[PDB]
Design a binder for this molecule. Structure first.
Ligand SMILES: O=P(O)(O)O[C@@H]1[C@H](O)[C@H](OP(=O)(O)O)[C@@H](O)[C@H](O)[C@H]1O
Lengths: 99, 119
């Protein structure tokens, strides 16, 4: 399902918690209450998961932009020593850009 | 100084760091004219905020705020024994920028942060 594919992707975003360089990070709260600190691309995707569950986007349209975010993130490798992308985050953007 | 002109001043200084010793590596960036520079990690993130400003993603004030935040952290790291002898040009850069009082400079004419020193 398009729906179940989305709930896959945000289960991956959860596990990118604390996978940050020396600088940077994005705080997002769950429905669980738990706060997580995640990379820029993964945060932009988490935001599209919110719009979806808030009836602002369809599953189809949410998943489209999610994949489009991942593809742009995959291309970006401008990172310095102080804000390195972790390998776990790199695999996530590759996986999601595949779909 | 306008915020715009302060940014242009900082980035002229970043360009002069081309080739100078970063002990934690280097970062290639390309100028608008096409020329490629190799600069340290703090200068490179400062350069990236300049780009975000030029693309209209940040205001001049918001760009300078993070530029100065990065130069403060980079200056603190540069005072360590590992780094504080062998990268002087990089040290002077991060020291100048970290000493900018932004909100006072936007009042006025470059204004510096007034503070106590043990001396
Ligand atoms: O905002 P920054 O200071 O650049 O911080 C980096 C970004 O959040 C990166 O997001 P990305 O993977 O989507 O590029 C992340 O992977 C890094 O670990 C952070 O250090």
């Amino acid at each position: 399902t398009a729906h179940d594919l989305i709930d896959e992707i945000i289960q991956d975003v959860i596990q990118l918690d604390g996978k940050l360089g020396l600088l940077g990070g994005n705080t997002r709260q769950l429905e669980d209450g738990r706060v997580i600190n995640i990379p820029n691309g993964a945060a932009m995707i988490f935001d599209d998961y919110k719009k979806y569950k808030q009836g602002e986007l369809t599953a189809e349209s949410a998943l489209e932009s999610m994949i489009k975010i991942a593809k742009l993130s995959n291309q970006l490798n401008r990172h310095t020593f102080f804000n390195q992308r972790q390998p776990e985050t790199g695999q996530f953007y590759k996986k999601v850009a595949a779909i």
